[PDB]
Amino acid sequence: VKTIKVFTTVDNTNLHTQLVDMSMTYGQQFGPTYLDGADVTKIKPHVNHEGKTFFVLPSDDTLRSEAFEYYHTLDESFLGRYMSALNHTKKWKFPQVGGLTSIKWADNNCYLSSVLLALQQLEVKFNAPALQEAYYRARAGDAANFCALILAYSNKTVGELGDVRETMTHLLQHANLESAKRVLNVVCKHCGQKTTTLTGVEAVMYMGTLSYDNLKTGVSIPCVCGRDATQYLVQQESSFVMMSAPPAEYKLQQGTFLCANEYTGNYQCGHYTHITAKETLYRIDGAHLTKMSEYKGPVTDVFYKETSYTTT
Numbered sequence: 001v002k003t004i005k006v007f008t009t010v011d012n013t014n015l016h017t018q019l020v021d022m023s024m025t026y027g028q029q030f031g032p033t034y035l036d037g038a039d040v041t042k043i044k045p046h047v048n049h050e051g052k053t054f055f056v057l058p059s060d061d062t063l064r065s066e067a068f069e070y071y072h073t074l075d076e077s078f079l080g081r082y083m084s085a086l087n088h089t090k091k092w093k094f095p096q097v098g099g100l101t102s103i104k105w106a107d108n109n110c111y112l113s114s115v116l117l118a119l120q121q122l123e124v125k126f127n128a129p130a131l132q133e134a135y136y137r138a139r140a141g142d143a144a145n146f147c148a149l150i151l152a153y154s155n156k157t158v159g160e161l162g163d164v165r166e167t168m169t170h171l172l173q174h175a176n177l178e179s180a181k182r183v184l185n186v187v188c189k190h191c192g193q194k195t196t197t198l199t200g201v202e203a204v205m206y207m208g209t210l211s212y213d214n215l216k217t218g219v220s221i222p223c224v225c226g227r228d229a230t231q232y233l234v235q236q237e238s239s240f241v242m243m244s245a246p247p248a249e250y251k252l253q254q255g256t257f258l259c260a261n262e263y264t265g266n267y268q269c270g271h272y273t274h275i276t277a278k279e280t281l282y283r284i285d286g287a288h289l290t291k292m293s294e295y296k297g298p299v300t301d302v303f304y305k306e307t308s309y310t311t312t
């Protein structure tokens with residue numbers, strides 16, 4: 001009975017020493033097993049695997065609690081879906097475009113590089129160590145893990161088309177937004193004044209208009225009385241906000257926003273590209289950069305810098 005010593009893990013931090021029988025496959029001893037993203041379930045150990053670290057599924061109490069602590073998901077197929085995505089994203093290219101980590105086009109991933117590009121420009125911290133650690137590696141240029149996690153957390157697979165806003169919604173559920181607050185003043189002609197306070201993801205996102213200012217000037221609201229009142233922004237406490245709408249012609253001017261996403265083509269199969277604002281306007285389209293004086297185009301999401309906003 002020849003054996004070699006390896007480590008199993010669900011989080012790449014807690015390592016569990018194992019003696020593996022070289023007579024049997026990894027799958028017979030650990031269940032489904034992965035090495036650096038590749039499925040090694042069907043193969044028997046090699047000599048050179050001595051001391052390597054293998055991902056396995058959470059199959060006992062210790063692994064399940066380490067997996068929850070690391071991923072904060074309570075979906076049991078998560079790690080397998082993560083690994084299956086990572087088998088692809090590890091073969092993607094993450095070039096520096098405009099000082100940011102982008103993604104070379106592959107597997108219909110253009111919506112994902114827009115997500116990735118936007119997140120590097122926001123001041124955001126993630127509640128799940130898996131996301132926080134991969135986020136750090138992504139901004140340094142090794143974003144394969146971060147992309148695969150974004151897919152797994154969004155219940156999307158490699159090669160599916162996607163929506164930036166829907167993707168950001170899932171990610172920000174694992175962001176630390178407990179201090180994020182949005183105060184909306186609502187008053188009907190009939191029932192008087194009321195203060196709605198949004199927190200968390202709903203404090204930083206809005207669907208319906210691309211303009212942060214249109215939230216200050218007023219949005220129409222249903223009321224339990226029966227009439228239509230008006231609410232608007234009296235207080236915002238967050239490091240950013242994200243304004244979204246169906247694709248509409250929008251002017252983007254330097255100094256007035258943080259970054260944005262353009263969407264061209266059909267709803268069934270379109271093309272996202274990232275617009276950011278530095279010394280001039282940048283368009284980041286996968287690995288391709290274009291600088292521009294002005295911009296007017298089909299925009300679906302605009303991000304704005306924020307800190308503390310009050311009308312007291």
Ligand SMILES: [Zn+2]
Pocket residue numbers: 188189190191192223224225226227
């Ligand atoms: Zn009313």
